[PDB]
Amino acid sequence: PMISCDMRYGRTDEQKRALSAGLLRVISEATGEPRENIFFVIREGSGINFVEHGEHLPDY
Amino acid sequence: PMISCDMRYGRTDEQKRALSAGLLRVISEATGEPRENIFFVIREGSGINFVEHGEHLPDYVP
Amino acid sequence: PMISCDMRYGRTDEQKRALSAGLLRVISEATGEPRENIFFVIREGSGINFVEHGEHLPDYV
Amino acid sequence: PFIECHIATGLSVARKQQLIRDVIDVTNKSIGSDPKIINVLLVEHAEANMSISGRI
Amino acid sequence: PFIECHIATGLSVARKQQLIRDVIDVTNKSIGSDPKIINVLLVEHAEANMSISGRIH
Amino acid sequence: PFIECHIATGLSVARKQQLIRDVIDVTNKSIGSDPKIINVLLVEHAEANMSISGR
Structure with missing residues (x-):
């Protein structure tokens, strides 16, 4: 997975x-x-790169 | 979505x-x-990371 | 593709x-x-953002 | 821009075609990107497989 | 957090709903993120379309 | 590397298995990654659901 x-x-x-x-x-x-067959990657970005409920998010 | x-x-x-x-x-x-039911995310990389038609794009210039 | x-x-x-x-x-x-119909994108991140065989990867070198 | 849209299944093939034509356009107009470099991917999902804002 | 899970076909509609509810839970517990800003997308595939650690089905 | 390939539906399972192997292989050759750390996800779509270069 x-x-x-x-x-x-x-x-x-x-x-x-x-x-x-x-x-x-x-x-x-x-x-x-x-667990060994589960690949997992995390992708990061600026707060403005994420939009929840029509509103862009503030940096974390 | x-x-x-x-x-x-x-x-x-x-x-x-x-x-x-x-x-x-x-x-x-x-x-x-x-709208409140829509999620959107922007992922960014260097132009070299973007290959269009086979050619890697140069860094974006604003 | x-x-x-x-x-x-x-x-x-x-x-x-x-x-x-x-x-x-x-x-x-x-x-x-x-080649004209193929788009390719690369996504980078440090080693900590990658988990293989149940272990976070060290930074690439 | 390589845009990927995940929406519930159920829209007519015509509505999906227009949806893609609209995203290419709205991108080009708001970002100034030549459509030659705009790539869109539309993928449908059963409602069950989509959780927005923690809602089941 | 927007978490996309690519798993093999076979789980029941109820087990998938439990799985969604669980990634949300374990996410909020480890990252502290509120469930209001957590999004989950479950997508199943045929085993053959998947290769982990270079293994061929 | 985690390579995800979005292609049109229509290839046979045998051919898709070959394409997976081909992806592992060239990734190992151009980047040098041991297959053990290579992951591939093949996903099929209807021609209608894919637009390249605004087409």
Whole structure:
């Protein structure tokens, strides 16, 4: 399985690994696929690059 | 609905809200989905990262 | 067709150029489509943003 | 610009064609990009597979 | 966070809904992001269209 | 590398398997990546759902 997370820039390396452990776990259980077969990439950007509810987001 | 736009770095904040304002309109217009129900994200890279017709684009110049 | 490649930052321009060339050849030969109908984009990020075999990757070198 | 639109299935093939014609146009007008370098991809999904703002 | 999950076909409509609700949950718990700004897109594929670690089906 | 290929529907499964192998291969050759760290996602679309160069 492949997973991708587009987030605003600013999260710490620690948060990102809590994210990957959290995401690999759930996808693994739901998929029956072992964690090692789950590819995961995080994509970062400026706050203005994200728009939620018609409004662009402020930098994180 | 979710919309993503992969484009070269350089575009101004002004150009991006005009882009989003327009992208959300046509999508909400063809989907009948409210604006608050649309998600949009812009991904940016260097021109060398953008290959059109086989040729890598030069860095975007605003 | 459209191809996207997510990989760590660090690859050179020469590598990137050989990458698109290789990729556009296989897509063409498989689809019949010419170079003019193929779009390719590369997305970069540091090692921490990439998880393989249940482990974050070190920065590319 | 390489735009990818994810919307629920159910629109007529004609409405989808116009939707793509409109995105090319709205981009070109708001960003000044030559359509020669605008690439659009429309992909449909079952409502069930789409969560916006945490809503199920 | 906009999280896109590419998984193999086979899960039930109910298990997929649980999975969506779970990535949202574990995201909000690790990143602290509010569910109002979290978006999820689940997309299934035939096993054959997927290659992990260079493995061929 | 995580290469995602968006192509028109119509190729046979056998051909798609070859295209996957071909992608691994050239990625290993132009970039030097061990296949073990190469991931490929093949996704099919109806010709109508794809626009290249505003066409």
